[PDB]
Amino acid sequence: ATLKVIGVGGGGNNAVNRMIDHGMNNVEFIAINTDGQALNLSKAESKIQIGEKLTRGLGAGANPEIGKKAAEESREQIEDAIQGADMVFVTSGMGGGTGTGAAPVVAKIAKEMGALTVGVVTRPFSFEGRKRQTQAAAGVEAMKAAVDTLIVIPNDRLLDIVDKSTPMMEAFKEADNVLRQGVQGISDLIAVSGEVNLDFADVKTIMSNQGSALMGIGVSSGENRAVEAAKKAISSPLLETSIVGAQGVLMNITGGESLSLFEAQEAADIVQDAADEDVNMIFGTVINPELQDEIVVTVIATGFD
Numbered sequence: 001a002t003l004k005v006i007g008v009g010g011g012g013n014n015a016v017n018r019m020i021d022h023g024m025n026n027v028e029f030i031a032i033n034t035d036g037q038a039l040n041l042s043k044a045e046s047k048i049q050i051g052e053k054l055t056r057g058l059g060a061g062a063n064p065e066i067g068k069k070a071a072e073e074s075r076e077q078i079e080d081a082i083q084g085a086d087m088v089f090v091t092s093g094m095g096g097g098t099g100t101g102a103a104p105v106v107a108k109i110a111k112e113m114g115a116l117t118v119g120v121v122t123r124p125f126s127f128e129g130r131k132r133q134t135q136a137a138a139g140v141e142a143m144k145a146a147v148d149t150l151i152v153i154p155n156d157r158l159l160d161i162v163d164k165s166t167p168m169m170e171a172f173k174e175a176d177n178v179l180r181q182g183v184q185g186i187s188d189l190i191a192v193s194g195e196v197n198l199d200f201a202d203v204k205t206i207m208s209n210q211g212s213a214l215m216g217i218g219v220s221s222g223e224n225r226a227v228e229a230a231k232k233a234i235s236s237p238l239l240e241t242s243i244v245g246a247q248g249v250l251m252n253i254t255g256g257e258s259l260s261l262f263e264a265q266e267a268a269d270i271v272q273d274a275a276d277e278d279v280n281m282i283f284g285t286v287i288n289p290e291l292q293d294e295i296v297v298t299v300i301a302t303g304f305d
C-alpha cells in the first residue's frame with residue numbers, strides 16, 4: 001500500500017517539512033501551494049504550484065475562493081501526483097486563502113482517484129480574529145464533505161500545552177505528532193503481519209466515509225503498562241474530536257513475548273469504556289521480540305457521526 005502525505009498551503013507545507021526533518025520511513029510527500037517562494041523551499045520530492053495565472057506565484061491573500069479556483073485549474077497535475085496512492089493524508093491550516101479553498105479540492109480529487117482520504121487540519125488561534133475563524137469553519141465543513149475521515153486540531157489547544165517560554169516552533173511540532181504518528185501507526189500495521197493481524201482492508205473498513213476521527217499512539221512499560229498506553233493513545237489535548245461517542249475502533253497492541261491476554265483485555269476495556277458506547281472493535285496484536293517491557297497501543301476511532 002502506497003501512502004502519500006499532501007501539505008496544502010503555508011501551514012500544510014510546513015507540516016510536510018517538519019515531518020521530513022523528523023524522518024518518515026515509507027511515505028511519499030507532495031507539497032501544494034500558490035506561493036512559489038514557499039514551494040521552492042519545500043523538502044518535498046513532489047511539488048505542485050497551483051494558480052500561477054491567478055496569483056503570479058504569490059499566495060492567495062486570505063481569499064479561499066482563489067485557493068479553490070487555483071486547485072480546480074490544476075486538477076490534472078494534482079491527479080497525476082496522486083495516482084497510484086492507496087491512502088492519502090491531506091494536511092492544511094484552515095483560515096488562509098490556499099489551505100481553506102484548495103485542500104477540500106485536493107481531498108475530493110484524491111477520493112475520486114480511489115484513495116482512502118484522511119484530512120488533518122487546524123483551526124486558527126482565537127487571537128487571529130472572528131473572520132478567519134468563520135472562514136476556517138467553512139473550510140472545515142467543505143473538508144468534511146470531501147474526505148473519508150477528518151481530524152481537526154484547534155490551534156487554541158496549543159495554548160493548553162505550552163508554558164510561557166515554549167518556542168512557537170516547538171508548539172508547532174507537537175501538533176505535527178497527530179498526523180505523524182497516525183501515518184506511522186497505519187504504515188506499521190500494513191507492513192507487519194501480526195499474530196492477530198490487521199491490514200489495510202481493516203483501516204479501510206474503519207475509516208471509509210465516516211466523518212470525524214481520532215488517531216492515537218500510546219507507549220508505556222512497567223506494572224500498569226497496558227492500561228497506561230491505552231489511556232495515552234486516546235487522550236490528546238489537541239483534539240477537537242475526543243474518544244467519547246466512538247462506535248467503531250481499530251485497536252492494535254504491540255508488545256514483547258511477555259504480552260498477556262489479561263492485559264490486552266484491560267487495554268481494550270479502557271478504550272471501550274472511554275467511548276461510553278458499544279464499540280464495534282477490530283482488534284489486533286503484534287508480538288515484537290525486539291521489544292522487552294514496552295507495549296504500544298494504536299487506536300483509530302470513528303463512528304461519531
Ligand SMILES: Nc1nc2c(ncn2[C@@H]2O[C@H](COP(=O)(O)OP(=O)(O)O)[C@@H](O)[C@H]2O)c(=O)[nH]1
Pocket residue numbers: 008009010011012014015059060061062092093094095096097098099100122123124125128132155172175
Ligand atoms: N499549527 C500550525 N498552524 C499553522 C501553521 N501555519 C499556519 N497555520 C495556521 O493556518 C492558518 C492558515 O495559514 P496558511 O496555511 O499559512 O495560509 P494559506 O497558505 O493561505 O492557506 C493560519 O491562520 C494559522 O492559524 C503551522 O505551521 N502550524
Ligand SMILES: [Ca+2]
Pocket residue numbers: 188189190191192193194197198199
Ligand atoms: Ca498487519
